[PDB]
């Protein structure tokens, strides 16, 4: 009962009206508008006031009316979207962070050396003899990884010292918080995450340059242990003891299923927004439609999940500019 | 009377219909229903009862076409007088206004009587034409 | 100690990049929501946002080249349109007319911002139908068996009632009768472009693309006009009034002549298919186009022409060697209104 | 001690599936390499192999339906149809795109046209010119990653990972101009109305090569339909020929009548489409006149998230009457080069004897 | 104008004689399956890629069969080394389908060396030994399946009772793994746990039973993302103390690749498996052979859609190699690849 109408440019150039007009334009613009509505519903639910289980949940962060999970992939940190995600972590707009190994270290490396633009068609050989690594259409000099080892080794030495002298049991979340404390840069995501008591989870932290650094470091000062069983209870109890949950996942892979499995323990989530470019014809979990997660209890049967088939680097800044940026005052 | 309207959505196979001003018998019928072409339409293929030509036409499913009225009679043709077709009409008169079917088929009726074969001559009456074609 | 080969492989020495390289930098919202500045950060953000920014720059270059005053007309061509400093081809698919993008393309046609239009058969039928009945919103997951029983046709996530096609027929049959007659008495030779211009004249609605196309003398080309509902309605009408002829060779001459006698050419294509190849073949006559922007979602791994990169057109001469075409891998309904809001809407009063 | 509610979600009670449920099995290589069994095992392997098996079953059903003898007492309208081809129990439409002729699939399509296994052919403008050119010059292999500047300097055109020299197109003009001259002469001196299908049928008689698809198509009286025939190399040749001998006219209204009547007067219809574009919608529009098709098989690599027609699922065509409600259409999400030879190796090849 | 004729018609150069022509398979000779699959190399777009992959795998197989003539102390492994070490990586959904039978054939006959998978690909193989998997459709609705307790994976259906039989099998085992940790000083890693589970399943149809019987290491960096994580979470409430260390497996997989004469890679899909194997091979300056089979694209900058040429940029593959990627669903092309390679050489793997 809703007609199809575009935006008439004879009225001028009004950006708010132009972004509102996507709800009735067509194929993926309708999905973008529905995603905007879902995120707005999340935001309005969160701001409602409550009327005590810090011991059970092992969390010193205070409780709210809606717990938000934010998951992202590694290649979105090498882009400018890093400057958007940080904006949400700086002002306590989210509750749980989920990422991969490569999505962590590239945030620290960016605090020491920059990244440049390139092209998709560059040959790999000449890039190899010149010591330049390619990520999509971005170029990273190899010299940036020589800065990371020098900054990283003493931290590992201190961690090994504290494991034996003080009986400290290390898990990926604790290691990420420790690394975020040491960088001491206000432009980093994980500095603000640890300053605001926001847990970050990464089940596979050894798949990246951190793994190589640990492997080389273990030949001199061995004994580092990273447990993952302890890190699973935390993320499960975050979802179990929540009044309401919402999910925002950019991409797919480990983080998508890891958030969905945690939300399964409370019989599903109440809101969900997906932004990725995967297709479901090969039976992969990455490309699964949101209606498949309803089948095995990851999403509630009465919810209205939305998926947008687009690149996140084009959609996420527009989504944030329409939902979170308009409620800046209420988050003070 | 000799011609009456009828909705061509209600026609059936082996009926009769006026196709391009000809009393044709329907041999094929189909319906395209309603969709992207605009309306339900009927495709009719018919064979003439006198000549034998094939006609084709297309109906909108709601409008009307004319169905003719055909009268079936079998006349008394017993005996050949003076070499002509002495039709023994029950009207009390004799006339040769009815000609033979064009070709050698019309010759097939007169020459078989000398061979001792009876024929049930049938004269077909149409909406506007008086010609004898049907033989049985 | 750790093996030396592993350390020599993991940790090499790089070579410093020239200072001409641009750094990756996004947009921070601590400065507020400035919409003009937010859309300029796309050029330095990431993967496809950079392509969007380069497309903006290419279209701006087209527009700036067009407005330079012209210093003759070669009016031998069957064209009543004067010659400018740059001729622009705009090509689009049929599914983009059924959406709201119809209201954007029309904005460019009403204000004489483009020169040649290329589309398919559906892109005319749906535009003419939308002036008689509206189109609604649906879902991708609706089942066809229950949709057919209620007389509703699906296009993506859009719904069209059957009755919308009942009105169009009623509006089209009287026109066709007047087109066969002129074919017999006045000796008029019909081509798809002439028929589209006639339909645009007949619709008489300021919200229609082709009404403004015919009012501003903008040619519209469509090599395959019989693939759709228009062809279906022509097929049924020929049972009462046979003898309709549509010729496709004069259209080829007309479109190929536009590129030959052009000072400069540019192309804007949304999607792929026959509209992309037809424009590329037209521009091959002048050894290639000077500017080009592509927006489609196809991929090249199957060898199709739709999924072809802009680099193949250089190989067979459709695009000049010394040009920089740009392609954006995105849905047009999300990036075309944003592209227009930064290039054509800004230079609005200069097209009077 | 775990929370009770959380234990009610992971360990949810289930139901029992109906007994007519197929399990999942692969092919065991311990028995050796048996190719027929290996290919039959695709029906239970998984995601896309199941679609491949279902497509095989659909094509086999088509073939079984076609071979049924007619009563041979029917009128079999030939004057209303304008066809010299006798009618069978099932009419088959075969549609394909341009790039599939530049590859080896051309030797797979011709095998079906040489032996009277299909009824109607639908393609694009490139699919005719490439097939005719292949009878004069050959085509070579290449790479997907090749710079266009160097290729253009040396005059070699790229189609995916295939290379075509320019001299292949120089041979086409010399062979093509006299035929066009004769066509224009016959248009005026003998009163002949030209349509794309008639022109395609004319060019297959001139190549006179048993390795050509359209030679066997015209030899067996198989119609080939192409709405946009001016989009390709042949269009440029006609454009340049028009400057010396103007007057050539191609009409596209008669081909529409021919292709629609081919489907109106059919006992049963089936569709096999490789790719998308104008051929897919053209065949669907032709089948709309008879209220849909009975069997259908799609093979292309297009997705539907952008509201396109090429990526449309077979269930969308049911909504507007292109496919019947009680049919079982199948789509395979795979490249046609890898799949079509395997589909023909199982159907149309095990029944070679029955088609003679 | 003559300029247009200078654009459509141009002079060209002669191609080198070492150029292969395009030619398909002729069906007038009958259906010869061995020659039909050989004609893919000169057929077209992706069939050429299939032929190149066949050649690459055959090169790997021939290299592996060359006899040697070696230090287990550094590698800490019992498996003897050959002239070529092969890594095989796969995703979770490929074990839920019929490709699970093709992998076991290679594992059963010592045709590969290292296995890399995800958490789901380990639990699905063990669950399949207790209950079967059925066939469904891609378009089945969610809440209707949820009410009947059926989980959908692509077009495959799994009842929840399967997970109720798995838990019963798993809880007694986990208890023991705690005891040995507190008494015998056992330090558990995911690979050791996978080996123990494969030994316990004791079914000749299982991949990991043959993997542990032939001393083939299996690696999974994230073992807590799936059903195993859920069972461990529920078990830790009454028997707490289980610890899984991931650093030692990182050491083991790297030392498996450093001390090798030659390396080959076969990866089915993308994700963490591809990057994990590539990072393992980076420590020897690259791999000699590589074959990829996945359906991901590169326009979004993802690692899964990365071309094989991008791995050359950061030293994952050698410069002088010829990597191949096939853009197709693995369930259609992996059995055909094993029909031409690893199967014609059966007699040489006794
Ligand atoms: N509603 C309809 O789609 C419709 C209606 C009537 C007739 N037809 C007939 O369909 C045939 C095919 O038409 P076509 O070639 O224009 O369409 P198509 O869907 O066959 O091909 C469109 C091409 O552009 C791409 N594309 C489609 N939508 C896009 C989008 N929103 N953004 C970016 N790329 C996009 C596709 O992937 C493909 O490469 C024509 O003969 C036409 O007359 C279509
Ligand atoms: N070599 C050429 O491609 C060539 C040559 C001359 C002219 N042309 C012109 O190009 C235009 C477009 O050609 P088209 O409409 O036939 O197709 P296309 O190239 O536009 O492809 C349309 C769709 O077909 C499907 N497809 C293509 N190749 C496939 C494959 N190998 N396997 C599976 N699916 C596949 C995809 O969905 C694709 O988006 C036409 O106007 C044609 O005349 C092409
Ligand atoms: N049944 C399941 O899928 C299942 C079950 C339990 C847990 N999980 C968890 O899901 C997470 C994500 O799974 P993943 O990372 O192993 O892979 P994934 O499902 O994210 O797929 C990754 C990529 O593999 C490729 N791919 C997938 N299927 C393919 C096929 N048939 N042919 C070719 N290429 C194909 C595609 O490029 C795809 O994008 C894992 O952490 C896993 O433990 C999955
Ligand atoms: N720069 C890097 O990417 C990098 C660096 C070092 C290590 N790694 C390691 O790579 C491993 C595997 O990669 P991953 O799973 O983290 O990421 P990935 O890029 O491989 O994930 C691919 C999935 O995310 C989707 N996706 C990715 N980018 C997208 C985008 N911009 N828009 C939309 N969808 C998008 C894909 O479509 C697919 O579903 C991780 O364990 C990581 O630590 C990556």
TrEMBL record, chain B:
Any Pfam family: eIF-5a
Question: Topology relative to the membrane, per the entry?
Answer: Peripheral membrane protein
One Gene Ontology MF term: translation initiation factor activity
Specify whether Cytoplasm is a keyword of the entry. Answer: yes
* Superkingdom to which the source organism belongs: Eukaryota
- Entry similarity comment: Belongs to the eIF-5A family.
Functional note? Translation factor that promotes translation elongation and termination, particularly upon ribosome stalling at specific amino acid sequence contexts. Binds between the exit (E) and peptidyl (P) site of the ribosome and promotes rescue of stalled ribosome: specifically required for efficient translation of polyproline-containing peptides as well as other motifs that stall the ribosome. Acts as ribosome quality control (RQC) cofactor by joining the RQC complex to facilitate peptidyl transfer during CAT tailing step.
- PANTHER family per UniProt: TRANSLATION INITIATION FACTOR 5A FAMILY MEMBER
Q: What is this protein called?
A: Eukaryotic translation initiation factor 5A
What taxonomic lineage is listed for the species of origin? Eukaryota, Metazoa, Chordata, Craniata, Vertebrata
């Amino acid at each position: 009962s809703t007609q199809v109408r575009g935006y008439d440019f004879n009225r001028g150039v009004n950006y708010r009206a132009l972004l509102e007009a996507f709800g009735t334009t067509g194929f993926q613009a309708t999905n973008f508008g529905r995603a905007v509505q879902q995120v707005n519903a999340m935001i309005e639910k969160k701001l409602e006031p409550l009327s005590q289980h810090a011991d059970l949940t092992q969390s010193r962060r205070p409780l709210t009316s809606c717990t938000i999970f934010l998951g992202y992939t590694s290649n979105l940190i090498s882009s400018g979207i890093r400057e958007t995600i940080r904006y949400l972590v700086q002002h306590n707009m989210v509750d749980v962070l989920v990422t991969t190994a490569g999505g962590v270290e590239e945030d620290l490396i960016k605090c020491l050396a920059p990244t440049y633009l390139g092209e998709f068609s560059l040959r790999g050989k000449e890039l190899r003899e010149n010591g330049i690594n390619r990520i999509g259409n971005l170029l990273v000099p190899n010299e940036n990884y020589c800065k990371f080892e020098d900054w990283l080794m003493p931290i590992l030495d201190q961690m090994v010292m504290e494991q034996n002298t003080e009986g400290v049991k290390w898990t990926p979340s604790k290691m990420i918080a420790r690394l975020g404390k040491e960088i001491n840069n206000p432009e980093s995501v994980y500095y603000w995450a640890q300053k605001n008591h926001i847990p970050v989870f990464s089940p596979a932290l050894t798949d990246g340059s951190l793994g190589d650094m640990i492997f080389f470091h273990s030949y001199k000062n061995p004994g580092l242990v990273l447990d993952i069983v302890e890190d699973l209870r935390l993320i499960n109890t975050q979802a179990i003891f929540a009044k309401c949950t919402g999910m925002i996942i950019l991409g797919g892979g480990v983080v998508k299923h890891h958030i969905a499995n945690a939300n399964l323990m409370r019989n599903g989530a109440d809101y969900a927004v997906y932004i990725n470019t995967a297709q479901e014809f090969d039976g992969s979990d990455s490309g699964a439609r949101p209606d498949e997660a309803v089948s095995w209890g990851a999403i509630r049967v009465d919810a209205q999940p939305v998926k947008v088939y687009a690149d996140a680097s084009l959609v996420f800044p527009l989504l944030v500019a329409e939902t979170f940026a308009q409620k800046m005052d209420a988050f003070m | 009377s000799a011609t009456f309207p009828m909705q061509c959505s209600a026609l059936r196979k082996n009926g009769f219909v006026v196709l391009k001003g000809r009393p044709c018998k329907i041999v094929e019928m189909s319906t395209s229903k309603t969709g992207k072409h605009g309306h339900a339409k009927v495709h009719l293929v018919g064979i003439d009862i006198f000549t034998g030509k094939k006609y084709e036409d297309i109906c909108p499913s709601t409008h009307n076409m004319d169905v003719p009225n055909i009268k079936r009679n079998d006349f008394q043709l017993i005996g050949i007088q003076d070499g002509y077709l002495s039709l023994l009409q029950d009207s009390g008169e004799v006339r040769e206004d009815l000609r033979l079917p064009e070709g050698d088929l019309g010759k097939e009726i007169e020459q078989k009587y000398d061979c001792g074969e009876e024929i049930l001559i049938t004269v077909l009456s149409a909406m506007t034409e008086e010609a004898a074609v049907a033989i049985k």
